[PDB]
Design a protein around this nucleic acid. Structure first.
Ligand SMILES: [Ca+2]
Length: 341
DNA sequence: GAAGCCGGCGG
DNA sequence: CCGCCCGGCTTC
């Protein structure tokens, strides 16, 4: 298995700088607002230089960067920018998995006919192409599975090319900090250190069960496989980006004859923004009181709009027995788990 | 089942 | 830092 993982450096920042080149060499800050207060989406080199970073409240960011340019975020254009890039990658890969707007996994095992060095060069070729074609720097990871490829990518930022070779893989498994693992955050590392575990290997000397009592099987076991180099878990042809449209109603209601004519339209601005076939739909409804009542059914394959309008209709109506007192302010749909062709 | 907590992650 | 968040595990 050869996976190249692609990560877009400070994408939103980069897109803006590409669109408005006079922003370059000068602090730029992309901002995000609630339903209110605003925070930093991303920030460019110079903004980051001064200490800005995601989540930072815009007041705070101004405290340390008054010379900065604060723009509102434009998801759609960054999405158009993302999709162009995902397509480039697509041509390069046997299977592509679009993890997010700025992340994709690529199985290329076949493309380079199993040759890991040609894997790395393909990975070089990809970096150079995105820069040449879109003026954007990404960070690649090349490794014999998804999880490793992400890890080595994050180890290689900014504008990196990380590498774990099947032939060398065990030395990397030997020096990996437990905290550097996806799924292991601030709390879990803090607790996992307590037995004497900061390297991945450490677990193998420590008994099995107690670890679950700190992790939960599904992760405790997922650590065990990584340590042993038994995690495979293929790269699937699916997009993980959720597409979802809402529509506020003329008045709060419960009359299905009123809300269907708003459900339909919410799906059209979504089941069209599909590019594939969703294994998941979620009917989402906001009440008079801002509270949220969301139900959704999983499909073996996907679901077309062929089944959609009634999957959504009964999914609303099931929420109309689950809540019986309250009215609906706003109605939404979310399509994710998209299978690609 | 389905609310709710906990913990991780990214706009 | 917290969400038309998220999933996973616990609990009525
Ligand atoms: Ca990112």
């Amino acid at each position: 298995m050869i996976v190249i993982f692609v990560d877009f450096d400070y994408f939103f920042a980069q897109v803006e700088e590409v669109l408005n080149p006079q922003y370059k060499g000068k602090p730029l800050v992309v901002c995000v607002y609630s339903g209110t207060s605003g925070a930093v989406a991303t920030a460019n080199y110079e903004a980051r230089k001064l200490g800005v970073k995601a989540g930072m409240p815009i007041i705070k960011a101004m405290q340390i960067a008054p010379s900065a340019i604060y723009v509102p975020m434009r998801k759609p254009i960054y999405e158009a920018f993302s999709n162009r890039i995902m397509n480039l990658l697509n041509k390069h890969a046997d299977k592509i998995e679009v993890a997010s707007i700025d992340e994709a996994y690529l199985d290329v095992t076949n493309k380079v006919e199993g040759n890991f060095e040609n894997g790395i060069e393909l990975a070089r070729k990809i970096k150079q192409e995105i820069l040449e074609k879109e003026k954007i720097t990404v960070t690649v990871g090349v490794a014999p599975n998804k999880i490793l490829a992400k890890i080595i990518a994050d180890k290689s930022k900014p504008n990196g090319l990380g590498v774990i070779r099947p032939t060398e893989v065990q030395d990397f498994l030997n020096e990996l900090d437990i905290d550097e693992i996806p799924g292991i955050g601030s709390v879990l590392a803090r607790r996992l250190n307590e037995l004497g575990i900061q390297k991945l290997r450490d677990i193998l000397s420590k008994n099995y069960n107690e670890l679950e009592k700190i992790t939960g099987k599904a992760k405790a076991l997922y650590l065990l496989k990584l340590a042993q180099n038994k995690y495979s878990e293929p790269v699937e042809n699916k997009s993980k980006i959720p597409h979802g449209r809402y529509l506020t109603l003329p008045y709060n209601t419960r009359d299905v004859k009123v809300i269907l004519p708003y459900l339909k339209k919410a799906i059209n601005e979504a089941y069209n923004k599909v590019n594939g076939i969703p294994m998941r739909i979620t009917v989402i409804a906001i009440m008079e009181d801002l509270d949220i009542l969301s139900k959704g059914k999983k499909f073996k394959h996907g679901i077309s709009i062929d089944n959609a309008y009634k999957v959504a209709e009964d999914l609303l109506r099931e929420l109309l027995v689950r809540d019986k007192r309250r009215n609906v302010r706003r109605i939404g749909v979310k399509l994710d788990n998209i299978i690609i062709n």
